[model samples]
Target: PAGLVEGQNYTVLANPIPQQQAGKVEVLEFFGYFCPHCAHLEPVLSKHAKSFKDDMYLRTEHVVWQKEMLTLARLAAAVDMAAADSKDVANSHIFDAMVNQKIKLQNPEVLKKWLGEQTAFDGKKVLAAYESPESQARADKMQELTETFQIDGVPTVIVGGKYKVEFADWESGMNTIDLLADKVREEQKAAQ
Candidate 1:
């Protein structure tokens, strides 16, 4: 089979997890805003995400490995809740601000200001969501997912909750995801 190896290129979950949607293939990306590798992978993944918009559902989970990461995750979750309609736009602004513009999102006030300047979302509402228990719970879920997925590093992609591929596996870089996606679609069709 011209596909990923079980133990080398990826890992097939012993017990497959359920997808959020019924028909579309769920692609979950576990990443950290603080990770340099994740910064590099953002554009590549973003491009692929747009290209595969109809075939797959892309969801990004911010991994909370430290205090800073926890804060970032909370902020991300807050944006997701407050700016549900503009979540992707908010995410792009965050990534670009942090990675390219060299803006640090460690401070809540600074982040709120940036959020207001970038998107149509209300900064106050977003900040409130960031501080709410619901947002905390969402961030907590990210942590739980990190453990459940056995993620060792950022830019990890889980396809259909069955196969996991790490950045290290993509020596050829971004194109590997396309190849893997095709293989996953093949497997999905076979199963159906």
Candidate 2:
């Protein structure tokens, strides 16, 4: 449940655990806003994260592998800073808006306008945060971490800060998460 083993059904990666004191398994969802696959997988992944809320620490990573993806992802980080408490809803909205509505949030002004329409989010603050050095650093780190996982595409789930579960690709969304949840539970038990 540490590093990925080639030719096996699953590939796990070794990484640092940020919440060393939490005593809970941390789950990271590596995703891109413009990726259709990530959009579709959002709901399923949300459910999985929610299910283990009591036993795990869940965090979603906004990966910027391209210009468009970076802009949209930065916008996502902006929303998080704007609506600190409602970041999850904002994230879902951005993911849906990009994948379903084909909204191109490439321009800072356009993104600000879009954020204005959202009643719960603060457009100005979000935009300001988007340009902050901290936000930029986080974005860069996400890209680096993604590469560490050897990710080939968007919407890859990394369980317990390590293990990269490999299910049958692009087929059943629910089943894949289910299999992953099982692996997480197994690792949890082993740790105990």
Candidate 3:
């Protein structure tokens, strides 16, 4: 928006984190399954994520500030691992199970049971990924980033690692992200 202001519409980061992808502006969304607001934004975020054609992509980091959140964070890592080879991570069922289904996924045994019964994925593979060291590594990164960004809220979006966008609603937030992505692209081009 023309009226968008820093510290009001968004905060400019003094120290930006290293972006995950090369030659692309990474839009990182900090979310958690336990957060109802994050759940509300999931569909909106996923649609926005799928809209990127090139030079940009949406990345999600499940936040972990409590012991229970850690378990859910690991669940996110495992899903990511299972969907690693895919171009997009569209594990909607998992999100639904964790958030809307009222399932106790934070419990290891219950998650395992839930995975085993699901026919969509190779349940065994998901469980293996969940228990692997690599899964924990991914979860660890989320925790580090959560702390790095000093993020205290769920569903916060950091654009190109430098700007945290705020908005009055989801539509404006999406519009702001588009503006920022264009801004980041121009900045990247000018530097080269």
Candidate 4:
């Protein structure tokens, strides 16, 4: 249940999906902003994640596969910080706008303006966080996670410590989440 066996699976640091959950069952969802599939999965995943509020810990890891991906991650992290404590919805909206609506969020000013229009978002705060050293550190940490996890693609989810979960394709990620959630529950029980 602890440590890698070596010569088998790649060893990734056992970081909880999000930093918020420690010493608990963590579900880490690794996704990129530009991936349309990730955009499609966001809402449903958010809802599903909420269902496990007490027993499960869910955190999102934004994968930076390109420069655009890094930009989106920075913006998302900024949004996450600005909304006080409730930034999931705001960040999700940004994902939708950029991925689904084809809005160019390349410019920080444009991003702030767009976020300002959203009731869930705080434009000024988000912009400030965008420049925060914490945000930069988070981005670097994300990059480190990607490398540590040895992920080659977007939309991969890691459960707890051992299982590396992925969808067969775009539509399958959600379906797999359900299946894996059950699997994680069983694994936890068995571990205990």
Best by lDDT: 3
Instruction: Write down the TM-score of every candidate.
Output: 0.75, 0.72, 0.88, 0.72
State the local distance difference test value for candidate 4: 0.66
Could you tally the backbone clashes for each prediction?
0, 2, 0, 0
- Model 2: residues >4 Å from true position, as ranges? 1-9, 14-22, 120-125, 168-192
Number of the top TM-score candidate? 3
lDDT of 3 by residue, 47-161 (tens): 7877885888888788888766777778788877876654133356666776778788889889888877765666667778888998899998888888877789888998888
Per-residue lDDT of candidate 2, residues 69-96 (tens digit): 6666666556656667666676777767
79-154: candidate 4 lDDT, tens digit per residue: 6567646666676777778787988786666776775677665666777788889787777777777777676776
Worst 10 residues of 3 by lDDT: 83-92
Kindly report the root-mean-square deviation of model 3 from the true structure over all alpha carbons: 2.3
lDDT of 1: 0.73
Q: Please give, for residues 1-192, the per-residue lDDT of candidate 1 as tens digits.
A: 345666666777776767777766788888877677777776667666777758776787898776667778888789878877766666666777787788878677677677666535466677778878998889988888777756777787878778777455344434556666677777888889
lDDT of 2 at 74: 66
Ordering by TM-score: 3, 1, 4, 2
For residue 69, model 4's alpha carbon misses the true position, in angstroms, by 3.1
Please list the Cα RMSD from the true structure of every candidate, rounded to 1 decimal place. Answer: 3.4, 4.5, 2.3, 5.6
